[PDB]
Design a binder for this molecule. Structure first.
Ligand code: FGO
Ligand code: PO3
Length: 395
């Protein structure tokens, strides 16, 4: 009896079913969402949430695009901030506080991100931060401390790659990985209100990655997640979402480490990219569906729900109350990596919340990074093309 089979049975016997479209394809995130929903549905008297997998997050935004074109939206969906900005152009979203969901206690890093013209339009649900994953055994073998600075990180990657005869810093050539280097080299995506993809810091960040590939210390990962590639060649480090935590733990044959990100100096950890999603509630939903959404959103924000979901996955608990929940405290007491994730979540930056950002980050910025890393494009030339395409899209 799979959780999704139990949910099907729950919704079949329910009088009111609120659909929740999501972008979890599998692993711990999907299981954890389905377990949270089974528990919620059990407590409700014939009022249920039906999670509907729409593929990954890009497939989900496409599926919601189609739903608007069709005139039939779900009750709830996952949404990045840029997705929220786009759904707001259509006035498609209910203000959350209008349902009477209380938001006091939600981390301001996350709550600020779903506030548009002073009004909250999403509930932070599955919010991730980048962390430094590392191979404790390989660092101990070679006497290499966990790097605290970008300088130490590069030095460590070079020393270990030479010692092991393979590039030990593994990365996906994507917008998310680029953001870590860009932000910690002093980069900002907006200058005087304008999106800029081709700033000196952007070029420096993309040049550092390309040089690491050329110099034999940085390993591009082009097929699957990093954790799905472990076992093939020496691995020391990656910068990756905390939502992958339990996938790394399951895959690693070595003693997995999690550290805060390397920063410019030891005075502060590096900034990590916030990813994962918020839940939104569509205006088109019936009063009865909207009341299910209200109850489900209070449940998602409850310390126990947050504690079980964050500890199952690596997501950052979105409320102060979650950290005080005994189930959270029990996991943290046995495993210091959960506290590491929360400490890193204090040093957190977001990409721009432009409605067009999904398209820019994958089709324009992501493509420029792939051109430079995989096809040896000149970093400034690749990012100048990106800038021109983004300027053209945003005009
Ligand atoms: N559509 C759209 N996507 C966006 C936007 N900003 C960022 N992202 C994507 O968020 C993913 C991070 O979201 P996060 O919830 O932290 O992590 C995901 C999965 O990454 C992660 N996962 C799953 C299996 C596994 O073996 N390892 C693992 O790490 O678990 C979660 C659920 O699938 C990145 C991935 C990306 O596709 O390169 C592009 C990124 C945006 O604006 N729009
Ligand atoms: O180094 P070769 O892949 O161009």
């Amino acid at each position: 009896m799979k959780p999704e089979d139990v949910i099907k049975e729950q919704c079949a016997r329910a009088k009111v079913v609120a659909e929740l479209w999501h972008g979890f394809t599998g692993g711990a995130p999907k299981a954890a969402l389905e377990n949270l929903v089974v528990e919620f549905n059990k407590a409700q008297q014939g009022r249920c949430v039906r999670p509907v997998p729409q593929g990954g997050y890009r497939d989900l935004s496409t599926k919601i695009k189609a739903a608007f074109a069709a005139g039939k939206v779900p009750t709830m969906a996952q949404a990045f901030e840029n997705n929220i900005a786009l759904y707001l152009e259509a006035k498609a979203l209910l203000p959350i506080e209008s349902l009477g969901v209380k938001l006091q206690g939600v981390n301001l890093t996350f709550l600020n991100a779903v506030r548009f013209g002073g009004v909250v339009y999403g509930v932070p649900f599955n919010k991730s931060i980048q962390v430094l994953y590392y191979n404790k055994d390989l660092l101990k073998k070679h006497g290499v401390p966990v790097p605290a600075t970008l300088e130490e990180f590069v030095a460590a990657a070079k020393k270990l790659s030479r010692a092991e005869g393979g590039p030990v810093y593994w990365f996906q050539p994507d917008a998310s990985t680029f953001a870590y280097f860009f932000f910690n080299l002093g980069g900002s995506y907006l200058k005087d209100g304008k999106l800029v993809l081709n700033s000196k810091e952007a070029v420096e960040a993309l040049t550092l990655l390309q040089n690491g590939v050329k110099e034999g210390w940085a390993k591009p990962i082009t097929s699957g997640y990093i954790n799905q590639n472990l076992g093939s060649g020496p691995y020391a480090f990656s910068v990756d979402t905390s939502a992958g935590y339990t996938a790394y733990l399951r895959a690693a044959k070595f003693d997995l480490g999690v550290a805060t990100l390397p920063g410019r100096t030891k005075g502060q950890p590096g900034y990590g990219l916030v990813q994962g999603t918020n839940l939104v509630v569509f205006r088109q939903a019936s009063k009865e569906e909207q009341a299910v959404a209200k109850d489900f959103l209070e449940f998602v924000l409850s310390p126990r729900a947050q504690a079980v979901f964050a500890t199952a996955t690596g997501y950052v608990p979105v409320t102060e109350g979650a950290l005080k929940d005994p189930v959270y405290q029990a996991y943290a007491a046995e495993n210091p990596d959960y506290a590491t994730i929360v400490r890193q979540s204090r040093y957190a930056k977001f990409e721009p919340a432009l409605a067009e950002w999904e398209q820019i980050r994958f089709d324009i910025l992501g493509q420029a990074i792939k051109e430079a890393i995989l096809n040896k494009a000149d970093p400034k030339a690749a990012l100048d093309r990106a800038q021109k395409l983004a300027e053209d899209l945003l005009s």
